[PDB]
Design a protein around this ligand. Structure first.
Ligand SMILES: Nc1ncnc2c1ncn2[C@@H]1O[C@H](COP(=O)(O)OP(=O)(O)OP(=O)(O)O)[C@@H](O)[C@H]1O
Ligand SMILES: Nc1ncnc2c1ncn2[C@@H]1O[C@H](COP(=O)(O)OP(=O)(O)OP(=O)(O)O)[C@@H](O)[C@H]1O
Ligand SMILES: Nc1ncnc2c1ncn2[C@@H]1O[C@H](COP(=O)(O)OP(=O)(O)O)[C@@H](O)[C@H]1O
Ligand SMILES: [Mg+2]
Ligand SMILES: [Mg+2]
Ligand SMILES: [Mg+2]
Lengths: 487, 170, 529, 52, 50, 140, 364
């Protein structure tokens, strides 16, 4: 009946070593330290053993004012987190403790945080496309419902902004539920997201909400920032398995989960692997990535962000994330500095449901023809930089202009970017997104100028913009004439 | 006994503002009034229009910002910074009374041009000034006109005919 | 009455760090707490707990009177975290991160606190005028914002922050003391003479009333260099909680990382990437997430942060640099290729952004910055071209280049004095002048009102002499019915009088004496304006 | 230690700071008498306050 | 000829930097393994000396 | 094998956590021997041994077209040829996106059939020339 | 009174451990063994404590023929070195012992080599151009009287020659006592300098000498090279503080000061930082640099040379040294290979006094 107590050996950073006379508990078990001594409930989590009497552990709260030999209580269970409808419209911590000052949480049940991945039989791959409203994605990377997505990119590219836009477009129209997991995110973005979901009434407290928000941020220690994504999955897998609903699982971001354990691996005594990462990175990530998967019961349409430090894809963290996705969206500094947003490189990214049979044939052929075109386009900057445009055939100049128009056309303004762009975002439908690329693919719109495609949505918006630019050009022409008439 | 107010996070908010406005009026140096706004805001009582206008009154009618003097004091700039804190930051919008306090100072300060900016801005917002102040603005203008004080003197003097880094004053 | 509690004796000392040997077994020391070391019967050497061990030994960071430390000295324990004095009484002082004042010629605040949670902070609404047009227009800094300053050595990293501190002063003397933004300059590992010159600079412009300086020089212990920026933010705590505003300037944070490396490695922590312990990301995270624009429930206070990180060969691939770009909202990248190439501040706009944008800057600056972004995005595509169509040059190729001239400064620029120079560019009044005279123009536009001199006074109010139109511009905006036409009927006269009387005389110069005289004039105009 | 600290605090050689000075706010009659000269005289006043 | 002269230097510095990056990563790992060896304690070695 | 590059990460994990001595890319020494324990079990057996055969198609993922990597270097040193796919061709409608110069089969003709030797021997004499021409010709 | 005595514990290189029965002296205390046993005098400064009843200490002379149970003697003070006008026109060792075979130095007082840096109140940075006569050095990176200078260049680029030219231009017409610290550079050069000056009557031994020479060269072990710069600064700080006189401080060079402390940190067992340097590099170098300042009492105009191995600025030693200086002079090899000498790279160089406030507007 009684819970056994353990005494601390040593404290080095976030890592603590605990004694246990009778026997050590299982791995990943939680361990409370009463708040009488350090002022706050210092929960801790076992990561590994050392001896039949000893086991070290992490702390998701900061170990401060913590003596040695303090009693450490065996809860008998790992980190239980609440699940239900009452988790909706609330900000939660790693422990499930609600940090917003809205009141307590009603909980008929409280599931743990670590669970086994779905068996191969439980899984289910259904080829069904997701309409994001974004114009690059709907062609080259048509996102699959119930599948996994990754917005790879460095700093300053728009992956977070893409998540905000995808929330705006998908989560509203998503009759199921949604989950956001901030993992090493900035604490300011949490405010902007919460205030948006409240203003958008995704979070409607007096009414009914459909968005759980979990936040373990840069301020938090590593043991918290590592155990967030699992918390969000405790929230989501309930809605999948029990409720049978469809779920959205946004993650900003998967890379901070990785380096949170890298910051501890040295303290654990595990020999570091190459670039400064833990040896168990791939396994540790797989134990989480596999939990994110549709089943017979429901479908999690996850979206993930990843930090590519120094814009080096060869970093093993992104490289290990490749296998665990279906739409490996990639963003690049080179497209971003050119004024093109979302700064997607269509050649460096490719999806799974980009097949002939899963999707429409016109979609597939138009997409592959554009990829095929931009390849030649790269090969021709490599020449025009050297010789000049005059050293190319007219048939070659044609695809230069077309690729130069597709590159600028696949840009799009977002409603979230009203602050930066100064323009209202546009929702582009999938069917409209093929009769506008395909038209541009076969010279149906070559008379239209180039900049008319820059930062607009469909093809109908173009001719509006081009008609304008004709007018604002005629103005300077005739005003030059009247300037000549005056003087 | 009024429409309950809420913060951006939807939290319920206090309205019992009177006890703080009295501390503004009892003030003697118009920097303590801003501090009353601060101690009011910490208590989940955000300022209302009446409070900001109490502060503009205390500004206009006080002698100095702090007990000791301060270089760079501008009785107008504090008043016109409260209105930026009002319109943009807090969402509250001023009224005829607020701009009235503002225009009185430019009369006292003798700056007749900024007044005309205020005169135009009022009516662009539907507000109408008191002619007692408009006529005093024009009076200061006519006085400075006849006296040669229409502009400062350093502008009404010839420039260096020869380019020289010292003559221009740099 | 007051009996000090002892925990052990000094076992070993390695420079800045030490190892304790506990006296008794049932005695227990906390973590991160301060200890004391009786270096003498009189004096005490403060310290801090960084490790605890199965042997009971304690890995200790020393902070004061290290030279007086020996082995066997009695070691005492306060059982409290490291704290420092805090309050308005500290403004106008240089201060050891332990709170001790550095001479020249009640309350206590925790050094490590949790940050404002996700409900206790308001989004960025209001600006922080750093005084430079690129940073006020295209890289808008706000309050509750944390924006990095990158750059290679000797590029202007220190000077942008100092000029921010110097721009705020004039305003703070005019506005109330709630909306004034104070400042803190933290010098980690710098040279003591650089600190002296900064003190004298601020004292000249009287920016020291609203500034304290946290000095942790190179000779100071590494633990003190380590806890310096925490001391700065610890002062920012009170001005947050007292509803005020405050600015932080963390001079090189790389030098705060070398210190953490020194500590951890000498205390036999495992190294990591580039010999750092590994959790040096969490370090700056703790430091920088404390920046926020606090909720109205918490006073609507703020603290802005301008961290600085040195760079080597213009790479953004080093460990600590990436660890900080990850954290900070934006960044002001300063390129030596541009510093060396003439322009100062050497801001590279392609690599410098701000993740707040219009919401920070002003109503009057939104409409100009949104125009400069369009104009520079278009000029970015063309300016590689050596100008061939000298008369067929696009208007963008004109306006952009004149705007680059206007970007050249030395000191901060007043808000009224910045827009009116940029408005002319975006609207093309300054297109007939040549590039080289873009600043002399600005000088006369801001400090020698031509129409007031040449009698062309039809404007009722709008003149640049008064300097109090800043507040009307800030509130109403330039694109307003009452201010737009008067603005145009000031600038077109300025242009015509310039183009006729001054420009004309300039192009008539042929001698070398007169042309060298006119030469140096424009460089002075580039500095003072 | 109290005596030592108190002795270190004081600087007899130095001059104590004077009371803070407000903005000049020169009257219109002064300026009407001397339009263009008051700027030069204020600059010379700063020069004398520093040197003389 | 000139482009080749540049290409050899580029290939040379590429491989120089490649090898130095390899060596550096090794010394990081060996530094950590060595520091841990210092972290590990010595035992007792109790045996008959008489 | 889809794929061996992950298998080596697993051997790294094991060996490092059990405190085996590390090496290049934090791998141990006998990780070349790891794949040699495996691939050499592929063979074309003798008529004293049933004349059976075990073929191997080990996959190894590169990063930024690097082949100087440790594992790639090793498997190339082990394998009886190689195939090299390229993304610059995969995007250009060339699928499977080989690079025939870097792709090699040291087993050139002994595997091919009677009908295949003549045909492929002509294709070598066609593509080796197609590159010398296609590389030098312009874009136009 | 009776002198404390301690007994050696272990030896790994120039580093030694000593068992002190009663208690251990403070750090930087010197410790002497008689020359009867080793054959020569051997002074050994404490640098860290291992436990109570133990101290780790580095040796200056070589540890050859040193045993594990030798009596060590606590001097009761740091390494003291002479100061005054008697230090003029004499060459000195790390220990302050003269080696020029002339005669007994007639010192009055000896100061320690380790010292707390000046206080912020004492510092007074006056910006004045230092006319070297060198032409790149004037325009691009104009030197500052009382400021610091850095000649950052690889092997065979010309920093040592710049120093010699500055000596012939600046030091001779300086009117203030100069100091020359040789730190891990060619002993050949010290011979040539002593003769270049003894002929120019700067080291007039029958008269008034305006120079002090200090040489811990590359032949010396790291214990000496690691503590010779301090020995020159004592000589210069006496003339800065007591005499209240301007001085010059030519260091050739500090990269071997760094190397020596690294070679020691390896022996001490401290975990190394990146490329193989000691963790405490920035601290050890700052404790040296910040002693070189211009107070109200006087001024030190230093000319520090720096070595860049493999022509790499990203080497932590120069990379740390940049932040401590007023005028960086980055030399190049490709410029030298092109026949230009001095092989300055003006794009990488920089200065502090390069403002119109200090230098006239046209020069800027
Ligand atoms: N806008 C500017 N106009 C004129 N000079 C400038 C400007 N910005 C910087 N400088 C000059 O550049 C030099 C160095 O500036 P700063 O002190 O900011 O360098 P830094 O970035 O701190 O580099 P380090 O830290 O290595 O000193 C100074 O001489 C300074 O006056
Ligand atoms: N101004 C100069 N004119 C001609 N030769 C020069 C000049 N400066 C340097 N050199 C040549 O460069 C070589 C090295 O000079 P120096 O002795 O300064 O090398 P260093 O920079 O000290 O490098 P190290 O310390 O590795 O020897 C010598 O051959 C020297 O003659
Ligand atoms: N759709 C867009 N339109 C215009 N600018 C954008 C867009 N997306 C991103 N940006 C620019 O990139 C910056 C960073 O976006 P963010 O999503 O925060 O980057 P990250 O995802 O790398 O953290 C923004 O502050 C903005 O300047
Ligand atoms: Mg982001
Ligand atoms: Mg600096
Ligand atoms: Mg040399």
């Amino acid at each position: 009946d009684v819970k056994q107590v353990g005494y601390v050996q040593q404290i080095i950073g976030a890592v603590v070593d605990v004694t246990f006379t009778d026997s050590v508990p299982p791995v990943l078990t939680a361990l409370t330290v009463d708040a009488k001594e350090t002022g706050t409930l210092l929960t801790m989590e076992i990561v590994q053993h050392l001896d039949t009497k000893t086991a070290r552990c992490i702390c998701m709260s900061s170990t401060d004012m913590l003596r040695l030999r303090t009693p450490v209580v065996n809860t008998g269970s790992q980190i239980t987190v609440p699940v239900g409808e009452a988790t909706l419209g609330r900000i939660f911590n790693v422990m499930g403790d609600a940090i917003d000052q809205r009141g307590p949480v009603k909980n008929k049940v409280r599931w743990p945080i670590h669970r086994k991945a779905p068996t191969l039989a439980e899984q289910s791959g259904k080829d069904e496309v997701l309409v994001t409203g974004i114009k690059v994605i709907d062609l080259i990377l048509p996102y699959c419902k119930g599948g996994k997505i990754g917005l790879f990119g460095g700093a300053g590219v728009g992956k977070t902004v893409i998540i905000m836009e995808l929330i705006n477009n998908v989560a509203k129209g998503h009759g199921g539920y949604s989950v956001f997991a901030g993992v090493g995110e900035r604490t300011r973005e949490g405010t902007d997201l919460y205030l948006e979901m409240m203003g958008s009434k995704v979070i409607d407290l007096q009414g009914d909400s459909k968005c759980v928000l979990v936040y373990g941020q840069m301020n938090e220690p590593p043991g918290a920032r590592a155990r967030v994504a699992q918390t969000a999955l405790t929230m989501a897998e309930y809605f999948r398995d029990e409720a049978g609903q469809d779920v959205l699982l946004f993650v900003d971001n998967v890379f901070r989960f990785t380096q949170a354990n890298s910051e501890v691996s040295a303290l654990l005594g595990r020999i570091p692997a190459a670039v400064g990462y833990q040896p168990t990175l791939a396994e540790d990530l797989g134990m989480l990535q596999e939990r994110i998967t549709s089943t017979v019961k429901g479908s999690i349409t996850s979206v993930q962000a990843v930090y590519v430090p120094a814009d080096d894809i060869t970093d093993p963290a992104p490289a290990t994330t490749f296998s665990h996705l279906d739409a490996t969206t990639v963003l690049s500094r080179s497209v971003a500095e050119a004024g093109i947003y979302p700064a997607v490189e269509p050649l460096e990214c490719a999806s799974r449901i980009m097949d002939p049979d899963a999707i429409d044939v016109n979609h597939y052929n138009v997409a592959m023809d554009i990829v095929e075109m931009l390849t030649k386009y790269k090969e021709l900057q490599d020449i025009i930089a050297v010789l000049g445009i005059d050293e190319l055939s007219e048939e070659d100049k044609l695809i230069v202009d077309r690729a130069r128009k597709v590159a600028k056309f696949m840009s799009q303004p977002f409603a979230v970017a009203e602050v930066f762009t100064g323009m209202k975002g546009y929702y582009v439908q999938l069917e409209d997104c093929v009769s506008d690329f395909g038209s541009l693919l076969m010279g149906q719109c070559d008379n239209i100028p180039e900049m008319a495609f820059y930062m607009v949505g469909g093809l109908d918006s173009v001719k509006e913009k081009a008609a304008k630019m004709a007018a604002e050009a005629a103005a300077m022409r005739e005003r030059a004439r009247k300037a000549a008439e005056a003087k | 006994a009024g429409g309950k107010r809420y913060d951006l996070f939807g939290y319920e908010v206090s309205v019992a503002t009177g006890p703080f406005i009295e501390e503004i009026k009892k003030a003697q140096f118009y920097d303590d009034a801003g501090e009353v706004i601060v101690k009011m805001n910490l208590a989940n009582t955000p300022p209302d229009l009446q409070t900001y206008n109490a502060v503009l009154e205390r500004i206009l009618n006080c002698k100095s910002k702090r007990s000791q003097p301060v270089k760079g004091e501008n009785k107008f700039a504090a008043m016109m910074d409260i209105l930026e804190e009002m319109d943009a930051r807090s969402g509250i919008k001023p009224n005829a009374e607020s701009w009235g306090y503002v225009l009185k100072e430019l009369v006292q300060a003798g700056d007749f041009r900024l007044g005309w900016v205020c005169i135009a801005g009022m009516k662009s917002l539907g507000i109408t000034p008191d002619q007692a102040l408009v006529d005093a603005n024009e009076a200061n203008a006519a006085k400075a006109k006849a006296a040669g004080t229409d502009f400062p003197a350093y502008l009404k003097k010839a420039a260096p005919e020869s380019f020289d880094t010292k003559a221009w004053g740099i | 009455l007051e009996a000090k509690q002892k925990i052990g004796f000094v076992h070993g000392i390695d420079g800045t760090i030490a190892t304790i040997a506990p006296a008794a077994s049932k005695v227990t020391v906390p973590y991160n707490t301060v200890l004391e070391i009786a270096v003498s019967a009189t004096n005490i050497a403060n310290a801090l707990v960084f490790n605890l061990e199965k042997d009971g030994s304690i890995g200790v960071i020393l902070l004061d009177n290290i030279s007086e430390v020996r082995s066997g000295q009695d070691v005492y324990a306060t059982g409290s975290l490291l704290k420092i004095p805090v309050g308005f009484h500290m403004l106008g002082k240089i201060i050891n991160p332990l709170g001790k004042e550095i001479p020249t010629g009640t309350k206590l605040g925790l050094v490590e606190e949790m940050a404002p949670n996700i409900v206790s902070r308001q989004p960025v609404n209001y600006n922080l005028l750093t005084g430079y047009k690129v940073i006020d227009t295209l890289i808008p800094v706000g309050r509750g914002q944390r924006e990095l300053i990158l750059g290679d050595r000797q590029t202007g990293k220190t000077s942008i922050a100092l000029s921010t501190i110097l721009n705020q002063t004039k305003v703070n003397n005019e506005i109330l003391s709630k909306n004034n933004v104070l400042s803190v300059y933290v010098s980690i590992g710098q040279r003591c003479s650089n600190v002296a010159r900064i003190h004298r600079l601020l004292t000249e412009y009287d920016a020291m009333k609203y500034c304290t300086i946290v000095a942790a020089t190179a000779a100071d212990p590494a633990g003190l260099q380590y806890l310096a920026p925490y001391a700065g933010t610890t002062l920012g705590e009170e001005f947050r909680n007292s509803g005020r505003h405050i600015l932080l300037v963390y001079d090189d944070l790389s030098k705060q990382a070398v210190s953490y490396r020194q500590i951890s490695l000498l205390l036999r922590r495992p190294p990591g990437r580039e010999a750092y312990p590994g959790d040096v990301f969490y370090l700056h995270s703790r430091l920088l997430e404390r920046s926020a624009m606090m909720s109205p429930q918490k006073g609507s206070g703020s603290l802005t942060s301008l961290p600085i990180v040195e760079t080597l060969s213009n790479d953004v691939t080093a460990y600590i640099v990436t660890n900080v770009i990850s954290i900070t909202d934006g960044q002001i990248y300063l390129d030596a290729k541009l510093f060396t190439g003439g322009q100062r501040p050497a801001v590279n706009i392609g690599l410098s952004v701000s993740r707040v944008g219009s919401s920070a800057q002003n109503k009057a600056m939104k409409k100009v910055g949104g125009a400069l972004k369009m104009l520079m995005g278009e000029y970015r595509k063309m300016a590689g071209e050596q100008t061939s169509g000298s008369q067929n040059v696009s208007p963008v190729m004109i306006r952009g280049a004149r705007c680059l001239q206007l970007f050249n400064q030395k000191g901060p620029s007043y808000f009224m004095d910045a827009i009116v120079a940029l408005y002319a560019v975006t609207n093309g009044y300054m297109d007939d002048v040549k590039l080289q005279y873009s600043k002399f123009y600005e000088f006369l536009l801001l400090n020698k009102d031509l129409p007031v001199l040449y009698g062309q006074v039809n404007n009722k109010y709008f003149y640049m002499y008064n300097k109090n139109l800043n507040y009307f511009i800030r509130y109403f905006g330039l694109n307003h019915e009452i201010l737009e036409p008067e603005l145009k009927k000031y600038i077109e006269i300025h242009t015509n009088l310039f183009l006729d009387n001054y420009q004309s005389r300039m192009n008539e110069l042929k001698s070398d004496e007169d042309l060298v005289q006119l030469k140096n004039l424009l460089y002075a105009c580039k500095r003072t304006v | 230690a109290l005596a030592k600290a108190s002795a270190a605090q004081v600087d007899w050689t130095s001059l104590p700071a004077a009371p803070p000075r407000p903005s000049p706010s020169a009257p219109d009659t002064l300026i009407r008498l001397l339009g263009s000269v008051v700027d030069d005289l204020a600059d010379a006043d700063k020069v004398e306050q520093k040197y003389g | 000829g000139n482009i080749t002269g540049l290409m050899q230097l580029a290939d040379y510095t590429y491989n120089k930097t490649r090898k130095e990056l390899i060596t550096a990563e090794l010394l990081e790992i060996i530094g950590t393994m060595t520091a841990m060896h210092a972290g590990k304690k010595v035992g007792l070695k109790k045996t008959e000396f008489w």
